Amino acid sequence: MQDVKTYLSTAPVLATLWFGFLAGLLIEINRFFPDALVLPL
Amino acid sequence: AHSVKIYDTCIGCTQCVRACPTDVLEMVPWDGCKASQIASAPRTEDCVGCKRCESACPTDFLSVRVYLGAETTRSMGLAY
Amino acid sequence: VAGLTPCKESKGFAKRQKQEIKKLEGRLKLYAPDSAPALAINATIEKTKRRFEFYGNQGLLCGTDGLPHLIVDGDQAHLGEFVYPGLVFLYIAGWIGWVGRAYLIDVRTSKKPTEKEIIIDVPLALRIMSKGLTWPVAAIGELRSGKLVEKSSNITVSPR
Amino acid sequence: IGPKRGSIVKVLRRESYWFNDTGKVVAVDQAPGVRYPVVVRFDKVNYAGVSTNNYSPDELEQS
Amino acid sequence: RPLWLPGSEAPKWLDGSLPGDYGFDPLDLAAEPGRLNWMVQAELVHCRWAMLGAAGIFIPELLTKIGILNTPSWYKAGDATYFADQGTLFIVELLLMAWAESRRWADIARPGSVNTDPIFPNNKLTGTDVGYPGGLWFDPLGWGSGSEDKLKEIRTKEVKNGRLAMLAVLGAFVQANVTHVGPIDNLFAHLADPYHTTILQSL
Amino acid sequence: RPLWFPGSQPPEWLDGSLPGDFGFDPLGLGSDPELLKWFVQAELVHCRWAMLGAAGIFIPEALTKAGILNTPSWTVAGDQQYFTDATTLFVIEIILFAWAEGRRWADIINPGCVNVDPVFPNNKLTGTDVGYPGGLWFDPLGWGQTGDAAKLKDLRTREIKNGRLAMLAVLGAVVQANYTHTGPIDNLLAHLADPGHNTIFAL
Ligand code: CLA
Ligand SMILES: CC1=C[C@H](O)CC(C)(C)[C@H]1/C=C/C(C)=C/C=C/C(C)=C/C=C/C=C(C)/C=C/C=C(C)/C=C/C1=C(C)C[C@H](O)CC1(C)C
Numbered sequence: 001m002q003d004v005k006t007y008l009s010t011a012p013v014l015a016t017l018w019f020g021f022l023a024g025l026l027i028e029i030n031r032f033f034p035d036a037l038v039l040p041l
Numbered sequence: 042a043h044s045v046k047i048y049d050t051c052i053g054c055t056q057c058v059r060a061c062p063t064d065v066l067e068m069v070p071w072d073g074c075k076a077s078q079i080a081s082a083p084r085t086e087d088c089v090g091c092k093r094c095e096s097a098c099p100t101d102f103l104s105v106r107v108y109l110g111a112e113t114t115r116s117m118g119l120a121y
Numbered sequence: 122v123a124g125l126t127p128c129k130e131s132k133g134f135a136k137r138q139k140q141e142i143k144k145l146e147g148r149l150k151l152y153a154p155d156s157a158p159a160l161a162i163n164a165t166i167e168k169t170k171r172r173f174e175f176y177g178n179q180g181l182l183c184g185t186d187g188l189p190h191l192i193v194d195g196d197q198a199h200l201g202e203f204v205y206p207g208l209v210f211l212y213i214a215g216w217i218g219w220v221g222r223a224y225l226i227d228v229r230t231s232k233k234p235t236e237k238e239i240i241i242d243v244p245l246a247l248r249i250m251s252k253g254l255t256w257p258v259a260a261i262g263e264l265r266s267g268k269l270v271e272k273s274s275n276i277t278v279s280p281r
Numbered sequence: 282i283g284p285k286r287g288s289i290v291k292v293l294r295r296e297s298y299w300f301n302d303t304g305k306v307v308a309v310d311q312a313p314g315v316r317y318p319v320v321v322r323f324d325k326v327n328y329a330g331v332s333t334n335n336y337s338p339d340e341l342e343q344s
Numbered sequence: 345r346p347l348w349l350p351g352s353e354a355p356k357w358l359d360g361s362l363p364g365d366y367g368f369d370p371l372d373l374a375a376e377p378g379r380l381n382w383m384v385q386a387e388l389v390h391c392r393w394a395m396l397g398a399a400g401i402f403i404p405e406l407l408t409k410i411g412i413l414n415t416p417s418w419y420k421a422g423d424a425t426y427f428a429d430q431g432t433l434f435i436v437e438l439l440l441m442a443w444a445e446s447r448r449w450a451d452i453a454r455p456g457s458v459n460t461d462p463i464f465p466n467n468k469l470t471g472t473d474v475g476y477p478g479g480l481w482f483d484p485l486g487w488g489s490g491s492e493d494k495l496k497e498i499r500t501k502e503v504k505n506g507r508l509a510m511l512a513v514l515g516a517f518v519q520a521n522v523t524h525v526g527p528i529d530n531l532f533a534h535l536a537d538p539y540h541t542t543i544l545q546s547l
Numbered sequence: 548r549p550l551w552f553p554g555s556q557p558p559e560w561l562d563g564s565l566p567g568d569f570g571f572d573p574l575g576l577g578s579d580p581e582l583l584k585w586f587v588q589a590e591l592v593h594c595r596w597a598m599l600g601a602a603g604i605f606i607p608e609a610l611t612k613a614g615i616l617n618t619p620s621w622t623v624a625g626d627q628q629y630f631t632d633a634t635t636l637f638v639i640e641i642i643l644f645a646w647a648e649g650r651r652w653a654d655i656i657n658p659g660c661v662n663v664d665p666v667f668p669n670n671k672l673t674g675t676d677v678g679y680p681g682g683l684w685f686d687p688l689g690w691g692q693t694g695d696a697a698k699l700k701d702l703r704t705r706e707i708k709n710g711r712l713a714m715l716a717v718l719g720a721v722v723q724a725n726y727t728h729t730g731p732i733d734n735l736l737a738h739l740a741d742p743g744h745n746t747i748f749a750l
């Protein structure tokens with residue numbers, strides 16, 4: 001974890017973990033709030 | 042043919058001569074560096090123009106500089 | 122506005138709702154009514170009917186094509202088409218731009234500044250990703266204090 | 282000659298990659314006749330990949 | 345001193361002199377030199393406008409619930425007619441806000457400069473600290489002077505009552521947006537069924 | 548020193564100083580000393596929540612089978628209707644555990660800082676180790692504060708090993724409900740009748 005977490009903090013893994021979370025969030029926004037063309041707020 | 046010019050920023054690192062594939066460059070004595078030598082191009086008519094010397098020059102910006110001018114059968118690299 | 126009828130009273134927008142369910146109802150005719158693929162088309166129809174009842178209730182403008190058009194001029198009726206989600210976007214996009222700028226300042230004053238960009242320091246990153254919440258007050262604050270911009274005497278400029 | 286060894290200088294040479302960039306002086310040659318005696322080391326490489334270059338004292342100022 | 349978070353180091357800019365200092369700058373919005381002078385003046389108008397805001401949002405609505413004023417709700421008070429036009433009262437306010445805030449703007453920029461009267465210069469404000477304009481027009485009872493330990497307590501009481509009013513007024517705003525009921529009735533609907541009148545039930 | 552794998556050499560990071568240390572680290576995730584103190588703190592609240600979990604899964608369902616109580620099964624206990632809705636039961640609990648675990652978050656980061664009661668400063672916790680807070684609210688009998696360290700380590704070892712049996716049990720109750728669709732007390736009595744056949748391979 002002095003070097004395992006260093007590998008986990010690298011540029012491709014952190015891009016995979018962020019965009020996995022980012023596309024995971026935007027899909028789950030698009031399930032409970034789908035077809036969103038106009039922001040009502 | 043091609044005009045190879047050496048400027049006073051040269052440190053005499055000799056690697057422009059070592060990268061030369063047609064024996065254009067040679068190291069002459071000089072008083073402007075720690076190595077006390079600068080490059081020169083006496084056989085610049087034999088220059089193909091490949092700029093291997095410019096790729097091997099560590100000085101920023103380059104001390105050896107090759108200007109592609111009139112091209113003859115020396116600087117075209119032909120065998121026919 | 123701009124020759125566009127509202128979508129709640131548009132006959133072309135109601136025609137597209139009619140011909141979309143009818144396309145999905147004819148897809149439902151070749152399945153059993155309690156089958157698993159028929160539940161997906163039944164959920165598709167309720168997703169379609171939720172969509173058309175949402176577009177008409179937001180004051181969207183529908184043209185002669187029966188399609189909702191966005192007015193991006195800054196109309197008081199049409200704020201949620203461009204102005205409201207644009208300010209929502211620029212806050213999020215400025216959040217990305219402020220925590221990436223503040224990370225580079227935090228790693229430029231380090232021992233090996235290039236190893237902190239291939240290997241992103243997550244305790245250093247996550248302590249300023251929270252700090253990107255209040256970024257218009259920190260970007261114009263750095264603009265007014267002169268820390269946002271660099272003077273041109275310390276900027277690498279290609280020669281003329 | 283030179284400003285100082287181990288000092289921070291800014292390059293005034295137009296054709297260098299490190300123009301208006303902070304550099305650290307590592308060696309100044311005190312031999313007469315040398316055109317570019319001050320050896321400045323930079324934290325960033327150029328396109329050739331090197332960070333060591335020789336400049337005259339007229340092309341540097343202390344910053 | 346007590347802090348906003350136990351076990352957390354206080355920031356170097358918030359040193360504990362300022363009344364109401366609990367080391368609460370997690371996002372570093374007052375780090376810069378010369379910036380914390382602007383953010384106290386910003387806190388002081390916002391806290392005093394919110395205590396003016398909370399006395400006009402909750403107190404006339406509470407007395408409407410008792411029924412001794414019959415004042416309309418604050419979010420429908422812009423639709424109410426008066427002796428003046430509602431659009432006209434905006435610009436007459438910001439001509440009077442152009443005077444009152446620009447006199448306040450010069451006090452933050454150049455302290456000790458605009459304490460004198462523009463017309464009759466014998467009338468001078470007795471306030472010494474920035475943001476505390478002591479004088480006959482603003483502090484006629486003379487409660488803003490005394491010992492520094494005594495003055496820090498009453499300046500701590502402005503902002504602790506002021507930060508509550510800011511949270512209050514920000515609460516009434518969102519309550520009137522998603523529930524469309526005035527906030528004294530939101531309190532009285534929370535003392536009847538507290539577990540069924542919650543922000544998740546009101547969405 | 549008892550060890551999980553008696554031929555194996557124990558790891559360097561597991562020196563036996565921790566309670567319940569048997570050298571079990573084949574993946575070596577506790578190699579970092581800073582991450583080991585976090586994982587011991589993670590294992591403590593995992594142990595005590597599972598023992599509190601096992602007393603709400605296996606204790607009242609044994610009383611449900613014996614007819615002592617008419618409580619529902621643990622899988623369908625959240626589906627039941629209460630006086631507070633289960634969506635807004637969470638945000639009451641989340642608010643109440645932002646003070647319970649958020650103040651516990653400071654003790655892991657900064658030891659000896661949240662041991663003083665903020666409302667009344669005279670009240671304090673009689674605890675010196677991270678993860679064992681002590682005081683009247685958490686150790687009212689004083690058994691966890693002993694002068695001798697060998698008995699104190701064994702009692703903390705007794706706490707861990709009672710915990711990790713329940714973390715097998717609550718995980719065991721989860722997979723039994725997913726596989727058998729039956730309460731784990733009823734899975735025990737089905738297994739106590741014919742243990743040769745009534746197993747995971749009974750399908
Ligand atoms: C505290 C630990 C514990 C205990 C005592 C039980 C007990 C029981 N389980 Mg089991 N189980 C456990 C955890 C536990 N399990 C775990 C962690 C899992 C997830 C893999 C499951 C998943 C599981 C399934 C899916 C099923 C059972 C079933 C059963 C019963 C039949 C035995 C069998 O087939 O075992 C199967 C055992 C396993 C799959 C895992 C082995 C259990 C642990 C990890 C090993 C032993 C630990 C420890 C030494 C036990 C001490 C016992 C001591 C108190 C006497 C029996 C009553 C079956 C049933 O309902 O019977 C009718 C059933 O179908 N178990
Ligand atoms: C250490 C190690 C070493 C190296 O590292 C490697 C490895 C292998 C990785 C390792 C190991 C690991 C493991 C074994 C793990 C596991 C864990 C678990 C299972 C946990 C649980 C844990 C668990 C837990 C907490 C639990 C909890 C519980 C709860 C809350 C419950 C609750 C409840 C109740 C009461 C009843 C009701 O009616 C319902 C409910 C509501 C449901």
Ligand code: SF4
Pocket residue numbers: 047050051052053054055056057058079080094097098099100103104105
């Ligand atoms: S490679 Fe460049 S610096 Fe080296 S001797 Fe040749 S011209 Fe001079």
